Design a binder for this molecule. Structure first.
Ligand SMILES: CC(C)(COP(=O)(O)OP(=O)(O)OC[C@H]1O[C@@H](n2cnc3c(N)ncnc32)[C@H](O)[C@@H]1OP(=O)(O)O)[C@@H](O)C(=O)NCCC(=O)NCCS
Length: 242
């Protein structure tokens, strides 16, 4: 189809990568990712990619424009791959993406790295993806009180002293993914205190526990398995709800 191939990638992004960056694969998901540089962004890249930006992103700063667009390219390519639709999710009033009917996905973008994954809602009701740069030990010791609950600081006291940046970065990433997976289901807003990390292993497997009631099904003590990958000085984590 001739016009859907008029949406070539703007030069500030590397080609959309389909390689799975996580330990365990998930059936029925499509994840695309890119490395971008907000400096290479051109004043006509949005029309080039065929992605209509909302009024907010038109007058935003260059770093935000690049992150939004790069995340929207990955989303459209992931969605195209799953079912063939070159559609971009709108921006909700609650800042969340507005995925098409019977589609659940997630978008993340950090320092020069972006990705998005999508799935049919009949396979995965909720999806939360989040990448975070590895915190330095100092800044991690400064943020450990906000991110880690006192039960987590005790449970992972060893890593808290030895591998400070890894543990805090991870709970940061896992808890943000958990939020992005459950929010389009529960509607409520919960924060770093409302979940705890329970176990994490080098093979990339993790497990979370809810600390408050979010819905009849998502009650206090409900647990969700997650996975994570630590490569390239950044940590990427995934929470998927069947
Ligand atoms: C959504 C949130 C977690 C992302 O913060 P971030 O990880 O620094 O930003 P990321 O780039 O990694 O993810 C950004 C994307 O999240 C998506 N997003 C925003 N709000 C969302 C929501 N309520 N539900 C699902 N996805 C959401 C958006 O698509 C955004 O990309 P866009 O704005 O370019 O479209 C953050 O805005 C937030 O609300 N943090 C507090 C909530 C939290 O941490 N709870 C812990 C629960 S244990």
């Amino acid at each position: 189809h001739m016009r859907a191939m008029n949406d070539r990638l703007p030069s500030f992004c590397t080609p959309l990568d389909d390689r799975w960056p996580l330990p365990v694969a998930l059936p029925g998901v499509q994840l695309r990712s890119t490395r971008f540089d907000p400096a290479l962004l051109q004043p006509g890249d949005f029309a080039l990619a065929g992605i209509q930006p909302p009024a907010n992103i038109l007058r935003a700063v260059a770093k935000r424009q690049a992150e939004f667009l790069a995340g929207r390219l990955c989303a459209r390519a992931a969605l195209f791959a799953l079912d063939g639709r070159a559609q971009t999710p709108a921006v909700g009033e609650d800042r969340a993406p507005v995925w098409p009917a019977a589609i659940s996905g997630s978008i993340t973008h950090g320092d020069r790295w972006a990705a998005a994954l999508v799935a049919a809602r009949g396979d995965w009701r909720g999806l939360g993806l989040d990448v975070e740069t590895l915190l330095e030990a100092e800044r991690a010791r400064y943020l450990h009180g906000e991110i880690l609950t006192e039960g987590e600081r005790l449970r992972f006291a060893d890593d808290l002293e030895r591998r400070t940046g890894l543990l805090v970065t991870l709970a940061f990433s896992l808890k943000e993914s958990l939020f992005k997976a459950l929010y389009p289901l529960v509607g409520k807003r919960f924060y770093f205190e409302h979940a705890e990390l329970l176990e994490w292993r080098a093979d990339g497997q993790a497990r979370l526990r809810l600390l408050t009631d979010l819905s009849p099904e998502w009650r206090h003590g409900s647990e969700l398995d997650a996975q994570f990958a630590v490569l390239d000085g950044r940590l990427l984590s995934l929470v998927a709800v069947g």
